């Protein structure tokens, strides 16, 4: 679980960084969808 929690924490910081970098809205969707996928496993 701790290994899976590490993935969610990291992916959640991925979508944050991309927001700070003012990346496109399309990219944010994809990465939020990744986080959603990971959260469903926890």
């Amino acid at each position, epitope marked *: 679980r701790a290994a899976l929690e590490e993935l969610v924490k990291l992916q*959640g910081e991925r*979508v*944050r960084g991309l*927001k*700070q970098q*003012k990346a*496109s*809205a*399309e990219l*944010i*969707e994809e990465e*939020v969808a990744k*986080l959603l996928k990971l959260k469903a496993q926890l």
Partner: antibody, heavy 122, light 111 residues
Framework: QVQLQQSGAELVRPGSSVRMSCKAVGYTFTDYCIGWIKQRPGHGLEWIGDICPGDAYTNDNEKFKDKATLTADTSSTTAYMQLSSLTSEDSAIYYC???????????????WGQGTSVTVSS | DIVLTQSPASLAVSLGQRATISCQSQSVSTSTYNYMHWYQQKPGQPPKLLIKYASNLESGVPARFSGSGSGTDFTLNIHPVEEEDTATYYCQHSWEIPWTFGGGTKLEIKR
């Protein structure tokens, strides 16, 4: 209940600086960004900037670069906006509103404060 | 910045009839989501979110309100129109920084 509790109306002189507060309760403070919106007659609504508490960063509007400064205090779950070099054009009602989830999609602003009227006059 | 053009600027609709408010801009939609939102603001009150993501009705908001469209064109619909619906209606995008609002549409109830 989610509530955004803003500070009272302010009367301030031109050239001075003002600082208003936004107390947010009923939800996890660091999971959402908070938007600031300017409303004065004849200009509708205008987005000033977003504050994203926790590891605090801001989403900036270039038109408010040196005019507005957005900060936050996580412990008291309060967002602050400071308006400097005040002119008559800064006379408006200012709302804070809970925006997007920090790790979620781009979003609208659902929960709004009752607004803080700022009068710039001598 | 992204310009949101609303039409009409003001509108007068009779009781029980339909109100149609339009918002035009550049494409603020992906292939999955439409990042246009609708607000209602009555006098002396803060604006209230009606619709998010073009067509999702906020809980507590009457079914008389509805939204549609994608990409460059979005429409707000009110049917049937009631006396308490007199207000200014705004569209807003959450596509890219900065977020901007439409000019607003002042809805008058006709009697």
């Amino acid at each position: 209940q989610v509530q955004l509790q803003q500070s009272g109306a302010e009367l301030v002189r031109p050239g001075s600086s003002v600082r208003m507060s936004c107390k947010a309760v009923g939800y996890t403070f660091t999971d959402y960004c908070i938007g600031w919106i300017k409303q004065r007659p004849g200009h509708g609504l205008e987005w000033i900037g977003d504050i994203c508490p926790g590891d605090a960063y801001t989403n900036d509007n270039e038109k408010f670069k040196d005019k507005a400064t957005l900060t936050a205090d996580t412990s008291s779950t309060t967002a602050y906006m400071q308006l400097s070099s005040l002119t008559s054009e800064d006379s408006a009602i200012y709302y804070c509103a809970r925006g997007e989830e920090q790790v979620g999609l781009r979003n609208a602003m659902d929960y709004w404060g009752q607004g803080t009227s700022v009068t710039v006059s001598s | 910045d992204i310009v949101l053009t609303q039409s009409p600027a003001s509108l007068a609709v009779s009781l029980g009839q339909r109100a149609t408010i339009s918002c035009q801009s550049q494409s603020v939609s992906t292939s999955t989501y439409n990042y246009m939102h609708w607000y209602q603001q009555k006098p002396g009150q803060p604006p209230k979110l009606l619709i998010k993501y073009a067509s999702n009705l906020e809980s507590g908001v009457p079914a008389r309100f509805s939204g549609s469209g994608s990409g460059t064109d979005f429409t707000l619909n009110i049917h049937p129109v009631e006396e308490e619906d007199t207000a200014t209606y705004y569209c807003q995008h959450s596509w890219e920084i900065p977020w901007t609002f439409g000019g607003g549409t002042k809805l008058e109830i006709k009697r």
